[PDB]
Paper text:
Clinically relevant [name]-[name]-2 [name] inhibitors, including nirmatrelvir, the active component of the Food and Drug Administration-approved drug Paxlovid, and ensitrelvir, which has been approved in Japan for the treatment of coronavirus disease 2019, target the cysteine protease active site of [name] to competitively block its catalytic activity. Multiple studies have identified an [name] mutation (E166V) that confers strong resistance to clinically relevant inhibitors, including nirmatrelvir, but the underlying mechanism is not fully understood. Glu166 is also hydrogen-bonded with the N-terminal Ser1 of the dimer partner to stabilize the [name] homodimer and intramolecularly with His172 to stabilize its active site.
Of the several proteins screened, [name] with four amino acid substitutions, namely, T21I, L50F, S144A, and E166V (hereafter referred to as QM for quadruple mutant), yielded high-quality crystals, allowing for structure determination by itself and in complex with nirmatrelvir, ensitrelvir, and bofutrelvir at resolutions ranging from 1.71 to 2.33 Å. The structure of [name] QM in complex with nirmatrelvir shows the inhibitor covalently bonded to Cys145 in the active site, as observed in the wild type, as well as various other mutant [name] structures with nirmatrelvir. A superposition with the wild-type [name] structure bound to nirmatrelvir shows that the positioning of the pyrrolidone ring occupying the S1 pocket is minimally affected, although a hydrogen bond between Glu166 and the pyrrolidone ring is lost due to the E166V mutation. The side chain of Ser1 in turn forms a hydrogen bond network to bridge between His172 and the pyrrolidone moiety. However, the trimethyl (tert-butyl) group of the 3-methyl-valine side chain shows a significant deviation in its positioning compared to the previous [name]-nirmatrelvir structures, shifted by ~0.8 Å away from the Val166 Cγ1 methyl group to mitigate a steric clash (yellow/green in Fig. 3B).
Residue numbers in the entry:
A (entry chain A): 1 to 49, 51 to 303
B (entry chain B): 1 to 301
């Protein structure tokens, strides 16, 4: 009953967040086993932009880094730069390290963000990797080091670490190996995201969520082909729908008795006519940050 | 940068969630120190749907009818009492991860984070508002009862909600942690209806301030108005009346934007009487009312 933008429980990640201080710069780190992962621009100041990280790191020693888990100080015994993240080796292993893995998500996938400041968790919310490799998050100054994650069984899959905000108000970051999502660099210079698109497979998953919860006015008796659908979808800046996407919506087709191409034809008419002052799941816009798997998980058993 | 529906970190509450089994019925409980709190209808079955005599059913139940499971460790019940619609199960083991907490009764218009759980395992977290009709617009499946809503005020977890039922319109109802329902609802399967809901005016205003802080300012005009004149219009659109308390609580956001509260009221009045001009505010084509002034301040610090 009901459908909400839902984040994963953040407990397993809260126990890994620490404060990383280097000189006057403070951000968050991720403490897993005896390593703290954090954005490399912690070694910079307003002075340090060409943010030539190589030089800045060379002049640093281990005592220049203060890692704080709450009030307990963790001693740094090593420091290394892997792409855009800094790996600080510490003498103490995190006793709350969950079973984890580092994954690189694809555009269209969703994840939970634990927004932190000064190593202290502030809030949790759900995001999606946009097609242009940005995310529409909520981050303030000092938020860098906050991570995005999924919980798969008992395993925390870390997929995002926050680095910067672009002039359009969207956010950009890396995986836990320091590799940015999208064509961005961790330097304050003129950078742009690129035209974003609507995640079509997710809109369809959300329309299936609407049917499961009673909203079914947008359903029509028409059907269509994938190519005919994609021809219309291109015009409205929608991502093209693939046969993989059709198969992943199968569970929702099974739960509703509505064929995917029948839902595609219902989506086609909504795009060309609008909602006529009506709402879908209490929204006057089409929502695209629910994957089919999110919908299946949330509507399980209805 | 950006504005999202943001829940509190749920870690402190995840460590209090347990499974309560009574016969064939399984739901969630809240384990604080040596007491487990759960909805009393865990002692019922489909048979008891007609005249559910909880007093009777509970006395007919003993301690061995309750199986409490914290992960794999079973907690033995050594006492049980019924406070209104919640059951207090005395257990032999105290939760070593019990946070500093208090039980509070929230007011309509206030928000809280919900930790949705099933079989004692936390599944997801999201933010909710206590609607003016004392329902909440949540997402719960079978077995979700016992899930709790909470706020974190400094170092204290303030528990304010325990989930009990879904109403025919798809909205949800529950009690505070003292067993007293929010709204005119009872914990039995009988004909119940929520009642006409209204829009939380002070929250819409706080959300308009959040949009201005984040760059959205097309709805800003040079107009202003009075409290009474605004309320005369808002009443027509099924908006809750704005009080001077609400005007004072929007003060922090007026300070952050330099926009007087009554000027933002005049912007909302125009939005109500003219529409949103096919435009969006913070990515919404409707006015949002589930962000309190505190939620915005905390997120936009
Ligand atoms: C991490 N602590 C912050 C997070 C930012 C601050 C405001 N909200 C956020 O999401 N990240 C930064 O300050 C990074 C950091 C230097 C500059 N920077 C930026 O986000 C800047 N933006 C850009 O350079 C742009 F637009 F190109 F993306 C800033 C102008 C400060 C907003 C580094 C190393 C990239
Ligand atoms: C707790 N585990 C469930 C949660 C429900 C199930 C589906 N989604 C939810 O939020 N609560 C219940 O099953 C409660 C429980 C008996 C009946 N009930 C209901 O929610 C029923 N609704 C009503 O009686 C109504 F409409 F009046 F609110 C039901 C018909 C099963 C949906 C008790 C003791 C209230
Ligand atoms: Br939502
Ligand atoms: Br404008
Ligand atoms: Br007046």
């Amino acid at each position: 009953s009901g459908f909400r933008k839902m984040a994963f429980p953040s407990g397993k990640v809260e126990g890994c967040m620490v404060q990383v201080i280097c000189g006057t710069t403070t951000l968050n780190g991720l403490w897993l086993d005896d390593v703290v992962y954090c954005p490399r621009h912690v070694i910079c100041t307003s002075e340090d932009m060409n943010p030539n990280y190589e030089d800045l790191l060379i002049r640093k020693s281990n005592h220049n880094f203060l890692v704080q888990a709450g009030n307990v100080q963790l001693r740094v015994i090593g420091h290394s730069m892997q792409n855009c993240v800094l790996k600080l080796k510490v003498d103490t292993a995190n006793p709350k390290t969950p079973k984890y893995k580092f994954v690189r998500i694809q555009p269209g996938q969703t994840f939970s963000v634990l927004a932190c400041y000064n190593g202290s968790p502030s809030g949790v919310y759900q995001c999606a990797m946009r097609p242009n490799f940005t995310i529409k998050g909520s981050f303030l100054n000092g938020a860098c080091g906050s991570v995005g994650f999924n919980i798969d069984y008992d395993c925390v899959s870390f997929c995002y670490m926050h680095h910067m905000v672009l002039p359009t108000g969207v956010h950009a970051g890396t995986d836990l190996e320091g590799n940015f999502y999208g064509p961005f660099v961790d330097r304050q210079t003129a950078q742009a995201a690129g035209t974003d698109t609507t995640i079509t497979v997710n809109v369809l998953a959300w329309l299936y969520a609407a049917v499961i919860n009673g909203d079914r006015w947008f359903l029509n008796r028409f059907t269509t082909t994938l190519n005919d659908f994609n021809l219309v979808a291109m015009k409205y800046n929608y991502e093209p729908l693939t046969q993989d996407h059709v198969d992943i919506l199968g569970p929702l087709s099974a739960q509703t008795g509505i064929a995917v191409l029948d839902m595609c034809a219902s989506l086609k008419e909504l795009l060309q006519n609008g909602m006529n002052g009506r709402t879908i799941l209490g929204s006057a816009l089409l929502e695209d940050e629910f994957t089919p798997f999110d919908v299946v998980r949330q509507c399980s058993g209805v």
